[PDB]
TrEMBL record, chain A:
Protein name: Photosystem II reaction center protein Z
Family membership: Belongs to the PsbZ family.
Signal peptide: 1-22
Described purpose of this protein according to its UniProt entry: Controls the interaction of photosystem II (PSII) cores with the light-harvesting antenna, regulates electron flow through the 2 photosystem reaction centers. PSII is a light-driven water plastoquinone oxidoreductase, using light energy to abstract electrons from H(2)O, generating a proton gradient subsequently used for ATP formation. May control the interaction of photosystem II (PSII) cores with the light-harvesting antenna, regulates electron flow through the 2 photosystem reaction centers. PSII is a light-driven water plastoquinone oxidoreductase, using light energy to abstract electrons from H(2)O, generating a proton gradient subsequently used for ATP formation.
Main location: membrane
Subunit record text: PSII is composed of 1 copy each of membrane proteins PsbA, PsbB, PsbC, PsbD, PsbE, PsbF, PsbH, PsbI, PsbJ, PsbK, PsbL, PsbM, PsbT, PsbY, PsbZ, Psb30/Ycf12, at least 3 peripheral proteins of the oxygen-evolving complex and a large number of cofactors. It forms dimeric complexes.
TrEMBL record, chain B:
Cell compartment(s), UniProt: Membrane; Plastid, Chloroplast thylakoid membrane
Cofactor, free-text remark: With its partner (PsbF) binds heme. PSII binds additional chlorophylls, carotenoids and specific lipids.
Subunit structure: Heterodimer of an alpha subunit and a beta subunit. PSII is composed of 1 copy each of membrane proteins PsbA, PsbB, PsbC, PsbD, PsbE, PsbF, PsbH, PsbI, PsbJ, PsbK, PsbL, PsbM, PsbT, PsbX, PsbY, PsbZ, Psb30/Ycf12, at least 3 peripheral proteins of the oxygen-evolving complex and a large number of cofactors. It forms dimeric complexes.
General function of this protein: This b-type cytochrome is tightly associated with the reaction center of photosystem II (PSII). PSII is a light-driven water:plastoquinone oxidoreductase that uses light energy to abstract electrons from H(2)O, generating O(2) and a proton gradient subsequently used for ATP formation. It consists of a core antenna complex that captures photons, and an electron transfer chain that converts photonic excitation into a charge separation.
Name of the protein: Cytochrome b559 subunit alpha
Membrane topology note: Single-pass membrane protein
Residues of the full protein shown: 20 to 83 of 84
Molecular function via GO: electron transfer activity; heme binding; iron ion binding
Photosystem II cytochrome b559 alpha subunit lumenal region domain location: 24-61
Family: Belongs to the PsbE/PsbF family.
Transmembrane domains' residue ranges: 1-26
Positions of heme binding: H5
Gene Ontology cellular component annotations, sorted alphabetically: chloroplast thylakoid membrane; photosystem II reaction center
UniProt: heme b binding residues: H5
TrEMBL record, chain D:
Residues reported to bind chlorophyll a 8: H141
Binding-site residues, chlorophyll a 10: H228, F234, Y241
Topology relative to the membrane: Multi-pass membrane protein
Top-level division of the source organism's lineage: Eukaryota
UniProt keyword terms in alphabetical order: Acetylation, Chlorophyll, Chloroplast, Chromophore, Manganese, Membrane, Metal-binding, Phosphoprotein, Photosynthesis, Photosystem II, Plastid, Signal, Thylakoid, Transmembrane, Transmembrane helix
Gene Ontology biological-process entries: photosynthetic electron transport in photosystem II
Residues the record lists as binding chlorophyll a 2: N16, R18
Protein name as it appears in the record: Photosystem II CP43 reaction center protein
From TrEMBL, chain F:
Family recorded in the similarity comment: Belongs to the reaction center PufL/M/PsbA/D family.
Catalytic reaction annotation: 2 a plastoquinone + 4 hnu + 2 H2O = 2 a plastoquinol + O2
Source organism: Rhodomonas salina (Pyrenomonas salina)
Binding site for Fe cation: H203, H257
Main location: membrane
Gene expressing this chain: psbD
Record-given protein name: Photosystem II D2 protein
Function text: Photosystem II (PSII) is a light-driven water:plastoquinone oxidoreductase that uses light energy to abstract electrons from H(2)O, generating O(2) and a proton gradient subsequently used for ATP formation. It consists of a core antenna complex that captures photons, and an electron transfer chain that converts photonic excitation into a charge separation. The D1/D2 (PsbA/PsbD) reaction center heterodimer binds P680, the primary electron donor of PSII as well as several subsequent electron acceptors. D2 is needed for assembly of a stable PSII complex.
Subunit architecture: PSII is composed of 1 copy each of membrane proteins PsbA, PsbB, PsbC, PsbD, PsbE, PsbF, PsbH, PsbI, PsbJ, PsbK, PsbL, PsbM, PsbT, PsbX, PsbY, PsbZ, Psb30/Ycf12, at least 3 peripheral proteins of the oxygen-evolving complex and a large number of cofactors. It forms dimeric complexes.
Length: 61, 64, 32, 434, 35, 341, 37, 327, 32, 45
């Protein structure tokens, strides 16, 4: 029950790092945000979902 | 520039490191090691007393 | 080229500077 | 372009000055800085809970945010002992996660958001000279601040309560049932002298006064916010102030400078909003605790050149105050204005009563006095009170400097000579000499 | 001592009021670039 | 041309670093002094001269590392490496404090060389030599403090050691044994230094706040160009401001800059006179009338008497470790204290 | 001490509070990237 | 002109006065004059003050056996602490003089006066149409004075810890501060020392470079200062010549070609240094003392090998025992 | 210490994340 | 307490003097044009 939570929040850290690197680059770059606008939405939704799941699993630990 | 300085500079840094790690600095400059500040016979602070016999006095003090 | 005032002064500063930096870095890892 | 000295007149080291006349980027910069502040709060809370050693007190571990959370009543039991650090972890997590949202908002409103707001969002745009709109924004944020103060009040009275050092037998988490809503007490606190023995607003010594004053502050801020939303500055106010972004910045700078000085004095002197079980004893508290411990060790046993009433007029470590009251003697005489929970039961109408110290003393008071004697901000360890006081005093001074700089430049720019003397119509050449 | 206190209070109040109402008298307009 | 003319032409060539004839004295002496100071603060100990560890090899940091003065057993010896004290032995020469003499002598000659460099560059450029006369201030400071004071004292031991904490120790030692704050020449030096700092700050602020609007940019550093025949700031506005704010103001730029030159130089020379007076223990330590008043009146106390007591405390509680050669042994009963005074 | 599940993430948390300083440095780096225009 | 109050405002903010008054001067002049006359009267004829509060007064007045150097206005009694102590809060005038009340009077009126001086410098800068940041420069000595007169007594809890208004009293304050806090090892006092030394060096250097490159506008029979005329539009010295001399004295890159940047640096350096040393005094008022390198070197056996910091600590201890008249 | 290595690795990644954005913007030639 | 006012008579200078000056200031304030200007500062005086 603890290893699952550790893996989940590690995935959350990795996704937060990826979003921090990508989102300003995607938005500022004139080439991006047209062919890859939905990628930002999917990444942010996955980030919030990971936050919610970590909050859920924190309860059982 | 970088071709010569990629060999001379690290070798010089390692030489400076070994000047201390091998204990040559203590021998050259007379700096006492942490285990030889006070001898068994002399537990006090060693001080030179005469200017014209300073070399012999330091030889006597640093002999042990 | 091989010998210049600027070159000699720079090396007179640098060859001891790097030697002393190595010595101090070694001093940092002494048991003390 | 608007992002270079050629098109703006501002160099890179003054580059944020290019944000004065663009609203969207300015809003983004402010939201990004807010995200930075929330990120620091969350990260430092996580850092402090990660380094918290249960046996040591909070003030012996160099912690400054955990005492703030403990004063609010979270994770603290009777006597100031810390039960669990999980609510502190939750606070840190919530701040550090909201920081991501605030940082995204700042980045969006700074980089890809519109440079100006009035052409696309007229409800948010401004000119720095439309007094009605600036007063409306001021009123909205005033309502926000008043609601924050009322949120603190609700925490004090409804959700868990606040830690009180003045509870009997040591501090405890108590619900503030009846705060002081009487305007006379609050006005007297605001109008009190700031010197020794009075202390102005720093000397508030009970939680009821704190909660009542925060009730008054919250409702007053809500009323003033609605006022500034529904009104325009009067003729006396319009002709007295400079109406530009830099002038408002200077006003905020002097306000926060005064607030920083007040907070430094609060951390140094106040032991009610800054409990000594979390922040450690104050300097006067430590000195008086050392004197009291010596007095106790003289009353018990009595071999420390004090066995009877022969020494002095009163007992040892006792003298009379400048107003005649009985106080602790010695070098601690300057700290006779200290009021601490472990010494209040031993003080009577005339001051410290020797027989009451002899008989009505409690072991927890002795333990508090000894542990405060061990850790002295002045001396007998760097106190967290010392860190807070020094840091915020320095911040208050440098922000007074910033206020002076920005106010002078706002005046010069409004008048129109902040770039230098015109050299064509020089003002001093028209004035007659002498 | 009360008479000294009332004199000091009178003087301080007078000077502070003069300062306050002087800086309220459109002080920004008192610049050489004002037209 | 001759060999001397060709050497003069080569030494005067416009290179990145000007050499000149004065360089032949400046560069080797200054380089050796700086290198010897680094060597002493890095490797050389003070254990056999002061009973102290002052080197990075012994564990000291930047503040506590110093090139300590020679042992008091040496008099005012030049401490030549080949001299009778060392007799060519580098290790014994470093142990007896000869590196301090090396640094001090080569540094004094480096200061002389730098002053000659200022003279030579002023002559070649074609300007008045008001540098190397300003530098006479620092030269006098160094000569009085590091050379004349130990020469007047017992030995080089009482000179300042070349270190941060060593300099702080020298300050407190001089205060304790001479009451140098009470010295009027030191007071004139303090006035000169503080007035020079005041002049620097006030002149910078006055010039920055009286500039002409010579540019359309808010940042006004671009509005100036070196090839200007016009003044970049209003002297009349500054004079009016300081005449109606302070009551007096500069009206001549040349007099203002000469005054900004003169104040620190005069302060340094007065302080040098005071230190020369200290060199022979000819100190303004005490006021005889105040001492007589305090002797016949135990209830008479001024801050001067408290300063005298403080200086007595520094002398007694530091003599034992600051002068280990004297073998001072003071019992706790003889040590002055505020309690039982 | 952190909770049991979050103990292994102590190092990154220890790096966390000094992040804003880097932000300041990052700004300078950005001004270095554009040539301080 | 329009009204009586308008005429009063015009006279107050008039540039035709010999000394500008202004609204800040309306507060500055009474406070400064009061503090000045009280300081003169106290320095001449004040009774001795029981500064330590243990009924042993300390004399600091000329009529009680002091000279100019040893004379001072003794700080307030330690029994007073930082309590507000005006004349009307004392039982008698003798009691007020005995407890160091004039020190509090002078300190408070002088701090109000220097704040008014900052504001008045800004006010006359605004009246003359010049830039207003001379007052920002003047904040640094004001900050230092407030730190040594107000902030340190607040942190310590007694005005008796403030700097005495004298010369020997100032020296005593410095020595006691060094003993208590080791200010010499404090990095902010080191920054202040660097600031004042750099200010002296830069003032001397700027004066030397301007005087060295003075353009010949005068004859040998008169002073060179007459080569400059007040109000002249041309520059009195050659910036290019001084820049070339400075760039040849050191390497070429180290030079201030821009005169405005050079003067900005001249203003900035000592002001920043004094700001840092005032901040250091403020921090040490709340016991944020300097670096402690005592007993930093030990041998293998564990015996402490002394450094220069140990000698400094010995001197500080020698001062400390003398300052504390109690155990 | 393994925790020291973890701290150094996390610090390196955080310090890389900053200039990485600027480098990517320069590669994509955006508004830098 | 309050503004150091331990005697009621001390309230007489603290109110009458600020009011009286204000009355003088009123003669200034009524003279000035009190309309909006939409500027950094009001040059009308
Ligand atoms: C304006 C005038 C400025 C000087 C007035 C005095 C400033 C001062 O002594 O402030 C101290 C007061 C607090 O006063 C203390 O307040 C204390 C309150 O504690 C009391 O109440 C507490 C309640 O927990 C405890 O019970 C405690 O035991 C009990 O003693 C005591 O009364 C002390 O005697 C009393 O001295 O802070 C305050 O009122 C808030 C005011 C902060 C002023 C900050 C300093 C002024 C600015 C300097 C700027 C310098 C740099 C710029 C230069 C240009
Ligand atoms: C600015 C322009 C200059 C720019 C900077 C220049 C820097 C370079 C030069 C700096 C160093 C110069 C050499 C100094 C060496 C010295 O001084 O060496 C000192 C020697 C004397 O040595 C001392 O002599 C003393 C007296 O001894 C005599 O008396 C004793 C009594 O017991 C014994 O009898 C003993 O045998 C007997 O010799 C003590 O013995 C001391 O221990 C011993 O050190 O003089 C001598 O060599 C020669 C003495 C002749 C005078 C020459 C120097 C004059 C300078 C001022 C000297 C101090 C005066 C007071 C200043 C305040
Ligand atoms: C916290 C302080 C702070 C803040 C909020 C800002 C904010 C801003 N500055 Mg200022 N600035 C600052 C400090 C700050 N600056 C300092 C210290 C300096 C001196 C070096 C400057 C010098 C300066 C100049 C000279 C200029 C600005 C400008 C700007 C604006 C746009 C910058 C731009 O084009 O980005 C371009 C930068 C990039 C493309 C690279 C950075 C990419 C992002 C922002 C990195 C963020 C990392 C973060 C982890 C991402 C989170 C993602 C999220 C989903 C979680 C913006 C409003 C400009 C402006 O708008 O003027 C009109 C301008 O001309 N600033
Ligand atoms: C407190 C500061 C602040 C201010 C004044 C604004 C103001 C604005 N934002 Mg920004 N924003 C902020 C913080 C702020 N935002 C933060 C913290 C985030 C991160 C979540 C965002 C993310 C954001 C986005 C993504 C967008 C805006 C947009 C807008 C505009 C319309 C918003 C609206 O109608 O309200 C909505 C009111 C509600 C009650 C909705 C409830 C939620 C307006 C100019 C929009 C725009 O186009 O303007 C640039 C837009 O697309 N904002
Ligand atoms: C951050 C909050 C904030 C801000 C920036 C403003 C800003 C403004 N207000 Mg608003 N206001 C606020 C909160 C705020 N107000 C609140 C909470 C209320 C409810 C009480 C009001 C009620 C209000 C009214 C009724 C009026 C203003 C007016 C004004 C304008 C001129 C104010 C002025 O000259 O001060 C003048 C300040 C004083 C005369 C000083 C009074 C100080 C009192 C006596 C307390 C003293 C405490 C202490 C002893 C001294 C200070 C100590 C310090 C260290 C704390 C200005 C636009 C005026 C205007 O033109 O708008 C229409 C106006 O008529 N405000
Ligand atoms: C909320 C507070 C606030 C705000 C919004 C502003 C906003 C502004 N100020 Mg003001 N200022 C303030 C407080 C504030 N200031 C204070 C408190 C001071 C006193 C110190 C000043 C002193 C000041 C001056 C003297 C000037 C401004 C200027 C400016 C403008 C441009 C700023 C800029 O580009 O920064 C650029 C940012 C930098 C160059 C970075 C500076 C970094 C500092 C020196 C390091 C300090 C230590 C650091 C915090 C520790 C981190 C360690 C790290 C280095 C490893 C802008 C309008 C300038 C201007 O254009 O006027 C309109 C100007 O000349 N301000
Ligand atoms: C500008 C060059 C310069 C100058 C002015 C000095 C000056 C000095 N040095 Mg330094 N030195 C220099 C270059 C210089 N040195 C260089 C390049 C080296 C490296 C080899 C050294 C290495 C060195 C050491 C190791 C020591 C000195 C010492 C000294 C001092 C004693 C000199 C003495 O009596 O020697 C006597 C010799 C001469 C003066 C040579 C003169 C030759 C004559 C004029 C020619 C005629 C000879 C005759 C016909 C036969 C003196 C202050 C000593 C000292 O005081 O340290 C404490 C010392 O120990 N120097
Ligand atoms: C120490 C002394 C402290 C004095 C504090 C002064 C605060 C500002 C007083 C200016 C007061 C002043 O004299 O200005 C009065 C100002 C101008 O007055 P007039 O002479 O033009 O009269 C117009 C009428 O509406 C009466 O005001 O009137 C207005 O701006 C609109 C009404 C606001 C009335 C004032 C409400 C807020 C007053 C706050 C008190
Ligand atoms: C605008 C501007 C222009 C140029 C200049 C400029 C200054 C460079 C720039 C500014 C840009 C700025 C200032 C941008 C602002 C950027 C900011 C403040 C970004 C905040 C990021 C925080 C994150 C991703 C934290 C998430 C926390 C988590 C996942 C918590 C997790 C936890 C869980 C769940 C459980 C426990 C474990 C952990 C892991 C601790
Ligand atoms: C991090 C940090 C913080 C703040 C900023 C900072 C200061 C820039 C930085 C510091 C960085 C640091 C640590 C910088 C340190 C740099 C260092 C240590 C430079 C050392 C140079 C040594 C020299 C020149 C010695 C030459 C020896 C000679 C000439 C020998 C002479 C000989 C002697 C003994 C005498 C006999 C004759 C001979 C034989 C000739
Ligand atoms: C002298 C010098 C040289 C050149 C000129 C110069 C530029 C002026 C200067 C530069 C000097 C220097 C030293 C410049 C150095 C500049 C550097 C290295 C700046 C680094 C910035 C990194 C940031 C802002 C990281 C943000 C990461 C976040 C928010 C994510 C965090 C986290 C991750 C892992 C994921 C979620 C969990 C959390 C914890 C939230
Ligand atoms: Cl005691
Ligand atoms: Cl003393
Ligand atoms: Fe100049
Ligand atoms: Mn003290
Ligand atoms: Mn003491």
């Amino acid at each position: 029950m603890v290893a699952i939570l550790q893996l989940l929040v590690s995935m959350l850290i990795l996704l937060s790092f990826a979003l921090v690197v990508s989102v300003p680059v995607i938005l500022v770059s004139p080439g991006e945000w047209e062919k890859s606008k939905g990628l930002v939405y999917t990444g942010a939704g996955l980030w919030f979902g990971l936050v919610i799941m970590t909050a859920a699993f924190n309860s059982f630990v | 520039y970088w071709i010569i300085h990629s060999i001379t500079i690290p070798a010089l840094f390692v030489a400076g490191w070994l000047f201390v790690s091998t204990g040559l600095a203590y021998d050259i400059f007379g700096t006492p090691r942490p285990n030889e500040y006070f001898t068994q016979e002399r537990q006090q602070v060693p001080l030179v007393n005469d200017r014209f016999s300073a070399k012999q006095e330091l030889e006597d003090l640093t002999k042990g | 080229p091989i010998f210049t005032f600027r070159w000699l002064a720079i090396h007179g500063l640098a060859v001891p500077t790097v030697f002393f930096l190595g010595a101090i870095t070694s001093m940092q890892f002494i048991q003390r | 372009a608007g992002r270079d000295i050629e098109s703006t007149g501002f160099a890179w080291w003054s580059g944020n000055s290019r944000l004065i006349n663009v609203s969207g980027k300015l809003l983004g910069a402010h939201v990004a800085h807010a995200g930075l502040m929330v990120f620091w709060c969350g990260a430092m809370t996580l850092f402090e809970v990660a380094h918290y050693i249960p046996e040591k007190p909070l003030y012996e571990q160099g912690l400054i945010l955990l005492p703030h959370l403990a004063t609010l009543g979270w994770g603290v039991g009777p006597g100031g002992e810390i039960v669990d650090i999980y609510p502190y972890f939750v606070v840190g997590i919530l701040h550090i996660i909201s920081s991501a949202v605030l940082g995204f908002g700042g980045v969006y409103h700074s980089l890809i958001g519109p440079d100006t707001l009035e052409e696309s969002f007229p409800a948010f745009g401004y000119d720095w000279r439309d007094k009605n709109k600036i007063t409306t924004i001021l009123g909205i944020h005033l309502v926000i601040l008043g609601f924050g103060a009322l949120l603190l009040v609700v925490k004090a009275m409804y959700v868990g309560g606040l830690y009180d050092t003045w509870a009997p037998g040591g501090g405890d988490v108590r619900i503030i049932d009846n705060p002081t809503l009487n305007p006379v007490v609050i006005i007297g606190y605001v109008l009190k002298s700031p010197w020794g023995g009075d202390g102005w607003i720093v000397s508030v010594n009970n939680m009821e006064d704190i909660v009542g004053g925060h009730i008054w502050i919250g409702f007053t801020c809500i009323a003033g916010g609605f006022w500034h939303i529904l009104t325009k500055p009067f003729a006396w106010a319009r002709r007295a102030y400079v109406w530009s972004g830099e002038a408002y910045l200077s006003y905020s700078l002097v306000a926060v400078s005064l607030m920083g000085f007040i907070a430094s004095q609060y951390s140094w002197y106040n032991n009610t909003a800054y409990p000594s079980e979390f922040y450690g004893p104050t300097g006067p508290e430590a000195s008086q605790s050392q004197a009291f411990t010596f007095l106790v060790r003289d009353q018990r046993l009595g071999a420390s050149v004090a066995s009877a009433q022969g020494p002095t007029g009163l007992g040892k470590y006792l003298m009379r105050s400048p107003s005649g009251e009985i106080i602790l003697g010695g070098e601690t005489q300057r700290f006779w204005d200290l009021r601490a929970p472990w010494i209040e039961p031993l003080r009577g109408p005339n001051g410290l009563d020797l027989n009451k110290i002899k008989n009505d003393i409690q072991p927890w008071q002795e333990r508090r006095a000894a542990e405060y004697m061990t850790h002295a901000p002045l001396g007998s360890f760097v106190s967290p009170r010392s860190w807070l006081t020094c840091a915020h005093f320095l911040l208050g001074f440098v922000f007074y400097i910033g206020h002076l700089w920005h106010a002078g430049r706002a005046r010069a720019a409004a008048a129109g000579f902040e770039k230098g003397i015109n050299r064509e119509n020089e003002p001093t050449l028209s004035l007659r000499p002498i | 001592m009360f008479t000294l206190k009332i004199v000091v209070y009178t003087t301080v109040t007078l000077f502070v009021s003069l300062f306050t109402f002087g800086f309220l008298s459109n002080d920004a307009s008192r610049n050489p670039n004002r037209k | 041309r001759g060999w001397f003319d060709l050497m003069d032409d080569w030494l005067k060539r416009d290179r990145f670093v000007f050499v000149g004839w004065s360089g032949l004295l400046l560069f080797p002496t200054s380089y050796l002094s700086i290198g010897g100071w680094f060597t002493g603060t890095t490797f050389v100990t003070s254990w056999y001269t002061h009973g102290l560890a002052s080197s990075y090899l012994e564990g000291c940091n930047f503040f506590t590392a110093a090139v300590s003065t020679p042992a008091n057993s040496m008099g005012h010896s030049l401490l030549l490496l080949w001299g009778p004290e060392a007799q060519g032995d580098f290790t014994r020469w470093c142990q007896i404090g000869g590196l301090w003499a090396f640094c001090a002598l080569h540094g004094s000659f480096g200061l002389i060389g730098f002053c000659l460099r200022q003279f030579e560059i002023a002559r070649l450029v074609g300007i008045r030599p008001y540098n190397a006369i300003a530098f006479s201030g620092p030269i006098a400071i160094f000569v009085s403090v590091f050379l004349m004071y130990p020469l007047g004292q017992a030995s080089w031991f009482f000179a300042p050691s070349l270190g941060v904490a060593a300099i702080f120790r020298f300050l407190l030692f001089i205060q304790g044994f001479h009451n140098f704050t009470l010295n009027p020449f030191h007071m004139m030096g303090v006035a000169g230094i503080l007035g020079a700092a005041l002049l620097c700050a006030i002149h910078g602020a006055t010039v920055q706040n009286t500039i002409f609007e010579d540019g359309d940019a808010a940042n006004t550093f671009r509005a100036f160009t070196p090839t200007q025949a016009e003044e970049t700031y209003s002297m009349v506005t500054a004079n009016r401001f300081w005449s109606q704010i302070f009551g007096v103001a500069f009206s001549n730029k040349r007099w203002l800059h000469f005054f900004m030159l003169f104040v620190p130089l005069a302060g340094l020379w007065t302080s040098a006179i005071g230190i020369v007076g200290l060199a022979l223990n000819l100190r303004a330590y005490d006021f005889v009338s105040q001492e007589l008043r305090a002797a016949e009146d135990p209830e008479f106390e001024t801050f001067y008497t408290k300063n005298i007591l403080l200086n007595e405390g520094i002398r007694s509680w530091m003599a034992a470790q600051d002068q280990p050669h004297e073998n001072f042994i003071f019992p706790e009963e003889v040590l002055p204290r505020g309690n039982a005074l | 001490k952190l909770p049991e599940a979050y103990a292994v993430f102590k190092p990154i948390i220890d790096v966390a509070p000094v992040i804003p300083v880097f932000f300041l440095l990052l700004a300078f780096v950005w001004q270095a990237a554009v040539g301080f225009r | 002109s329009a009204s009586l109050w308008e005429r009063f405002c015009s006279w107050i903010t008039s540039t035709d006065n010999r000394l500008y008054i202004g609204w800040f001067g309306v507060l500055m002049i009474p406070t400064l004059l009061t503090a000045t006359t009280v300081y003169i009267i106290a320095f001449i004829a004040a009774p001795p003050v029981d500064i330590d509060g243990i009924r042993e007064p300390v004399a600091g007045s000329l009529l009680y056996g002091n000279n100019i150097i040893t004379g001072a206005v003794i700080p307030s009694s330690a029994s007073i602490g930082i309590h507000f102590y005006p004349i009307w809060e004392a039982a008698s005038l003798d009691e007020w003089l005995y407890n160091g009340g004039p020190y509090q009077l002078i300190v408070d009126h002088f701090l109000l006066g220097v704040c008014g001086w900052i504001g008045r410098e800004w006010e006359f800068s605004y009246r003359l149409g010049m830039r207003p940041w001379i007052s920002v420069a003047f904040t640094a000595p004001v900050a230092a004075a407030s730190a040594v007169f107000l902030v340190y007594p607040i942190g310590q809890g007694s005005f008796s810890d403030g700097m005495p208004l004298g010369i020997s009293g100032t020296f005593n304050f410095m020595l006691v501060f060094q003993a208590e806090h080791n200010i010499l090892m404090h990095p902010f006092h080191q920054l202040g020392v660097a600031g004042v030394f750099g200010g002296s060096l830069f003032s001397a250097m700027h004066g030397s470079l301007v005087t060295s490159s003075l353009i010949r506008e005068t004859t040998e029979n008169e002073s060179a200062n007459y080569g400059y005329k007040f109000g002249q539009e041309e520059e009195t010295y050659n910036i290019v010549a001084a820049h070339g001399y400075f760039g040849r004295l050191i390497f070429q890159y180290a030079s201030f070609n821009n005169s405005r940047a050079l003067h900005f640096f001249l203003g900035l350096w000592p002001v920043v240094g004094i700001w840092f040393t005032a901040l250091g005094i403020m921090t040490m008022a709340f016991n944020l003392n300097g670096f402690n390198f005592n007993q930093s070197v030990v041998d293998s056996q564990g015996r402490v090998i002394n450094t220069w910091a140990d000698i400094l600590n010995r001197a500080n201890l020698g001062m400390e025992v003398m300052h504390e008249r109690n155990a | 210490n393994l925790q020291t290595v973890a701290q150094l690795i996390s610090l390196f990644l955080i310090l890389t994340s900053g200039p990485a954005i600027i480098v990517l913007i320069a590669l994509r030639r955006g508004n830098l | 307490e309050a503004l150091g006012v331990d005697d009621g008579r001390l309230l007489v200078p603290l109110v009458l003097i600020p009011v009286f000056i204000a009355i003088l200031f009123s003669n200034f304030a009524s003279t000035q044009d009190n309309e909006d200007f939409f500027d950094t500062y009001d040059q009308r005086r």
